Amino acid sequence: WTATSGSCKGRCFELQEVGPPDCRCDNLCKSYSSCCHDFDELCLKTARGWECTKDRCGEVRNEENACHCSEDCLSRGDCCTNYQVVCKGESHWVDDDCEEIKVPECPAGFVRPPLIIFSVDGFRASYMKKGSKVMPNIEKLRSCGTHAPYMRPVYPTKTFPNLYTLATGLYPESHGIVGNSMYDPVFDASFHLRGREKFNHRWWGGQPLWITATKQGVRAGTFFWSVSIPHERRILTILQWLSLPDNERPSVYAFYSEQPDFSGHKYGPFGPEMTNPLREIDKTVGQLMDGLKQLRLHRCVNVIFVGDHGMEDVTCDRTEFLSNYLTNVDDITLVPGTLGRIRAKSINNSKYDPKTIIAALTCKKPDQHFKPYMKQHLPKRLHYANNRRIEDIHLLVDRRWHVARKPLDVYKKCFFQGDHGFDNKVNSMQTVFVGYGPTFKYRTKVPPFENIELYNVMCDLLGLKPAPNNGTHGSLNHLLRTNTFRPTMPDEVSRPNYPGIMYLQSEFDLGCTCDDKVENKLEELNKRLHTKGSTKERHLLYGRPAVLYRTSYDILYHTDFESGYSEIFLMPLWTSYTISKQAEVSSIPEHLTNCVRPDVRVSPGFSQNCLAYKNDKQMSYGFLFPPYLSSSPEAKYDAFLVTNMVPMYPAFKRVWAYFQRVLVKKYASERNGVNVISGPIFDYNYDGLRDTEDEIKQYVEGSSIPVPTHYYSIITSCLDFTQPADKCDGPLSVSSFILPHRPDNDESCNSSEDESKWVEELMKMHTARVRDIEHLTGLDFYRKTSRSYSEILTLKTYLHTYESEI
Numbered sequence: 001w002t003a004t005s006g007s008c009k010g011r012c013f014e015l016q017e018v019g020p021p022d023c024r025c026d027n028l029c030k031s032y033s034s035c036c037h038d039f040d041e042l043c044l045k046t047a048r049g050w051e052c053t054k055d056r057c058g059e060v061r062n063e064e065n066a067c068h069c070s071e072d073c074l075s076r077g078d079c080c081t082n083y084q085v086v087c088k089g090e091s092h093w094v095d096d097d098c099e100e101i102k103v104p105e106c107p108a109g110f111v112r113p114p115l116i117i118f119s120v121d122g123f124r125a126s127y128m129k130k131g132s133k134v135m136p137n138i139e140k141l142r143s144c145g146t147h148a149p150y151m152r153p154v155y156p157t158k159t160f161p162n163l164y165t166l167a168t169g170l171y172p173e174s175h176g177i178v179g180n181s182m183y184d185p186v187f188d189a190s191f192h193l194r195g196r197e198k199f200n201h202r203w204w205g206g207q208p209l210w211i212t213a214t215k216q217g218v219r220a221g222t223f224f225w226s227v228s229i230p231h232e233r234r235i236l237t238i239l240q241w242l243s244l245p246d247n248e249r250p251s252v253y254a255f256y257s258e259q260p261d262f263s264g265h266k267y268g269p270f271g272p273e274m275t276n277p278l279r280e281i282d283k284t285v286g287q288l289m290d291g292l293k294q295l296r297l298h299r300c301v302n303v304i305f306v307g308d309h310g311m312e313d314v315t316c317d318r319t320e321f322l323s324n325y326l327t328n329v330d331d332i333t334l335v336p337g338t339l340g341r342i343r344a345k346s347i348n349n350s351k352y353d354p355k356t357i358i359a360a361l362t363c364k365k366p367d368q369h370f371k372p373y374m375k376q377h378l379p380k381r382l383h384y385a386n387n388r389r390i391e392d393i394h395l396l397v398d399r400r401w402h403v404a405r406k407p408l409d410v411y412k413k414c415f416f417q418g419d420h421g422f423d424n425k426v427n428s429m430q431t432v433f434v435g436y437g438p439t440f441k442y443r444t445k446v447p448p449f450e451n452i453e454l455y456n457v458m459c460d461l462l463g464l465k466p467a468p469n470n471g472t473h474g475s476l477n478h479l480l481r482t483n484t485f486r487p488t489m490p491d492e493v494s495r496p497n498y499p500g501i502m503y504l505q506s507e508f509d510l511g512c513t514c515d516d517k518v519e520n521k522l523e524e525l526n527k528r529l530h531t532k533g534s535t536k537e538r539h540l541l542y543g544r545p546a547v548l549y550r551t552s553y554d555i556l557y558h559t560d561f562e563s564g565y566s567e568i569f570l571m572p573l574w575t576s577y578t579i580s581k582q583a584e585v586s587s588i589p590e591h592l593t594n595c596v597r598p599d600v601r602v603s604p605g606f607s608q609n610c611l612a613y614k615n616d617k618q619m620s621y622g623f624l625f626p627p628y629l630s631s632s633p634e635a636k637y638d639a640f641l642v643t644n645m646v647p648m649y650p651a652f653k654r655v656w657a658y659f660q661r662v663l664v665k666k667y668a669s670e671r672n673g674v675n676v677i678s679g680p681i682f683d684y685n686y687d688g689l690r691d692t693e694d695e696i697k698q699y700v701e702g703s704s705i706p707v708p709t710h711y712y713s714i715i716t717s718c719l720d721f722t723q724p725a726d727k728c729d730g731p732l733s734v735s736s737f738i739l740p741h742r743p744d745n746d747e748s749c750n751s752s753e754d755e756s757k758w759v760e761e762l763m764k765m766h767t768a769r770v771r772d773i774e775h776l777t778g779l780d781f782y783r784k785t786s787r788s789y790s791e792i793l794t795l796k797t798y799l800h801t802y803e804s805e806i
């Protein structure tokens with residue numbers, strides 16, 4: 001029960017939640033069955049429409065009307081948004097030439113520029129050019145404010161996961177909303193778009209914008225609107241709130257539209273029936289902007305126009321069914337659609353074996369429109385593993401496709417031509433961002449960015465201190481006229497050692513051999529200087545990376561490379577080298593194929609040994625700086641030092657050798673030299689963060705040599721490619737990857753062919769931001785450049801997608 005029969009009179013859309021069992025007069029009361037008897041009557045008026053007409057101007061105030069055209073209307077703060085246009089001969093906001101907003105132009109009482117979030121659902125990024133003829137208001141915001149060509153959602157590209165990421169600056173794995181449908185195995189409860197479970201606060205983690213504001217003394221408008229409340233009402237409600245007295249008036253507001261997503265599901269992203277939903281949205285933006293112009297706020301408010309995700313062509317006939325792959329289809333549960341998630345049907349069966357499930361789903365059809373992963377082996381750029389609500393088995397589905405359990409689920413559980421939720425680098429999933437206001441720049445285009453980054457920015461605009469999030473604060477400073485935030489480099493925690501020659505050959509008993517005895521007054525002081533760092537500014541162009549945790553490590557210098565060697569992990573944390581466009585590839589000579597040499601700078605005790613790799617049949621080794629790319633036969637001996645050595649599965653050595661022998665030189669060709677930094681990553685617990693010495697779960701058999709989970713590389717050159725990588729005067733260009741280090745190549749269905757048909761496709765799939773690598777290594781790159789630090793934080797958030805132009 002709820003004794004809900006008090007009044008809403010004078011309380012229509014109040015900002016507080018009053019104590020039960022009283023009656024409420026806010027957006028959630030409809031959802032909670034808690035509204036006052038008169039709520040509909042008073043708080044949802046519709047009489048006479050939403051627009052003034054020439055025969056209403058200066059009328060008798062009739063309280064029952066939806067909005068007003070009377071003389072007192074501006075004072076009451078409740079006119080129809082076109083009241084000035086009809087009754088006072090003022091022009092629409094779209095019709096005015098935009099004039100730069102050099103300073104905020106706010107009425108008295110207004111301490112700071114308000115922020116209005118205008119969020120639109122399923123608004124595909126290509127709509128801004130393709131629908132530009134039927135969206136004159138939106139086009140003005142875009143062209144006069146600050147806009148990206150598109151904005152990147154988070155995976156899965158679904159509604160609830162994206163709205164709450166916008167709200168928090170968190171990955172879905174961190175905020176807890178990992179899909180529109182979820183099973184928590186500890187709650188033993190399910191979360192769905194339909195029903196009541198979603199109303200409990202235990203699902204929603206992190207701290208969203210409106211809570212962050214509240215706790216810091218900034219009043220917030222609503223971020224939930226009933227579907228039944230028409231969009232015209234939503235706007236007048238926001239405009240009413242802006243009219244309130246100073247100490248009652250919120251600083252941050254939200255408007256949400258269900259369109260164009262609701263139609264895109266029925267008609268597909270470009271159906272002819274899509275023109276009217278785009279017409280609708282542009283009117284609502286017109287109404288808001290005319291409304292702000294009325295109350296003198298259109299040169300004072302910051303507006304964000306933003307989408308949750310895009311929309312792809314998807315139909316029933318493009319459904320892959322699991323019952324065509326698995327005999328035991330009734331011992332699994334599947335979360336279906338544009339992404340697949342599998343768990344056991346019953347916890348009782350300990351016979352349920354994820355390995356057999358994955359084996360049956362791997363490369364079984366030449367056409368296969370999905371690929372199975374254990375969640376820990378998904379690309380790290382999706383950050384979709386670390387939550388108990390994400391099932392162990394995941395299916396990445398091809399764009400334009402679906403997966404289901406059995407055919408009966410499709411025709412009795414065709415009505416649709418659109419869907420979304422695919423991999424977040426897929427063009428059709430990209431969405432929009434426009435910023436318009438005093439605090440944004442004027443007629444400015446910025447590079448595409450991720451939606452995780454907007455939390456920090458909306459905090460700046462409101463003078464708040466952002467709760468801990470996954471954005472990189474400072475990386476979007478270039479969108480703003482003036483910044484609240486001045487970013488600074490983290491301090492180095494561990495300074496390196498610089499060992500000289502301290503050990504004799506005969507002190508080592510590592511089980512390694514090499515043909516290196518056969519070998520001057522000229523050349524001895526030449527290669528002396530290389531071990532002392534004479535060519536440090538050739539192979540290490542942006543400073544040594546900084547180690548941001550407490551450890552024990554050595555810098556080691558060579559003619560062709562320089563490395564950060566960990567005494568704790570017995571292998572380098574990072575290896576840096578520059579391959580110029582002129583450089584040549586050469587082969588490993590017959591006598592040096594088994595060559596591994598002790599390093600006289602590093603002790604036998606803090607060194608790897610050949611014996612452990614001999615003992616381990618499953619485990620061979622590779623090298624971080626590639627022998628193939630040695631600058632001279634004399635130099636090559638450096639590449640074989642035991643301190644350049646890393647553990648690698650034979651299967652992985654195939655991917656690695658082809659990267660080192662073919663791809664590095666080809667990049668150097670295209671990019672006018674490249675500088676590469678490569679290293680191991682240890683993330684056994686898949687939280688996306690480096691693992692400490694006492695979290696290692698795998699060692700090369702009988703050794704203390706830890707086994708990396710991934711291997712990374714960062715590849716940097718000059719954005720103006722007419723300048724060589726190592727003599728670049730301005731901005732830089734980068735691409736990176738995080739290869740999973742796996743004992744098989746089951747992920748690449750074509751792997752039995754030559755490496756040239758598959759390896760590059762694999763690396764493309766595991767593309768990465770420098771910032772992802774920093775989280776996983778505890779390192780900090782690009783310490784010493786000529787570029788501003790804001791420009792460097794942008795560089796670090798960059799992701800090279802290998803998609804063609806939108």
Ligand SMILES: *[C@@H]1O[C@H](CO)[C@@H](O[C@@H]2O[C@H](CO)[C@@H](O[C@@H]3O[C@H](CO[C@H]4O[C@H](CO)[C@@H](O)[C@H](O[C@H]5O[C@H](CO)[C@@H](O)[C@H](O)[C@@H]5O[C@H]5O[C@H](CO)[C@@H](O)[C@H](O)[C@@H]5O)[C@@H]4O)[C@@H](O)[C@H](O[C@H]4O[C@H](CO)[C@@H](O)[C@H](O)[C@@H]4O[C@H]4O[C@H](CO)[C@@H](O)[C@H](O)[C@@H]4O)[C@@H]3O)[C@H](O)[C@H]2NC(C)=O)[C@H](O)[C@H]1NC(C)=O
Nearest residue numbers: 173174175176204205206386387388468469470687688775
């Ligand atoms: C993206 O950004 C986010 C935010 O910055 C990063 O996530 C943070 O990472 C931290 C490191 O993992 C983590 O810090 C821990 O916090 C513990 C307290 O946790 C609660 O309080 C915070 C603060 O309000 C709150 O945010 C948390 O919310 C989580 O949990 C609730 C309910 O369960 C969820 O509703 C919510 O969605 C969120 O879940 C997420 O995080 C949990 C873990 O917290 C995951 O399991 C989920 O999958 C989900 O992603 C909590 O309510 C604190 O107690 C910890 O301190 C222990 O550990 C450290 C390190 O050893 C140490 O300093 C302490 O001594 C202490 O040790 C004790 O526990 C150890 C482990 O069992 C053990 O070794 C000892 O024996 C001790 O008993 C710890 O500091 C922080 O909570 C999250 N924040 C969020 C919001 O997720 C994220 O990493 C970033 N991602 C990337 C890729 O960079």
Ligand SMILES: CC(C)(C)OC(=O)N1CCN2C(=O)c3cc(-c4ccc(Cl)cc4F)ccc3NC(=O)[C@H]2C1
Nearest residue numbers: 117119163164166167198199209223224256306454
């Ligand atoms: C109603 C119930 C399901 C109980 O939960 C709620 O009320 N929420 C659940 C969480 N939430 C959201 O994440 C949410 C975010 C946005 C949003 C959009 C863009 C930008 Cl730049 C920032 C944002 F914040 C818009 C609309 C929205 N819609 C909601 O519904 C609210 C409140």
Ligand SMILES: [Ca+2]
Nearest residue numbers: 683689690691
């Ligand atoms: Ca980790």
Ligand SMILES: [Cl-]
Nearest residue numbers: 158179180181
């Ligand atoms: Cl889902």
Ligand SMILES: [Zn+2]
Nearest residue numbers: 121122159308
């Ligand atoms: Zn959506």
Ligand SMILES: [Zn+2]
Nearest residue numbers: 122159261265
């Ligand atoms: Zn949708």
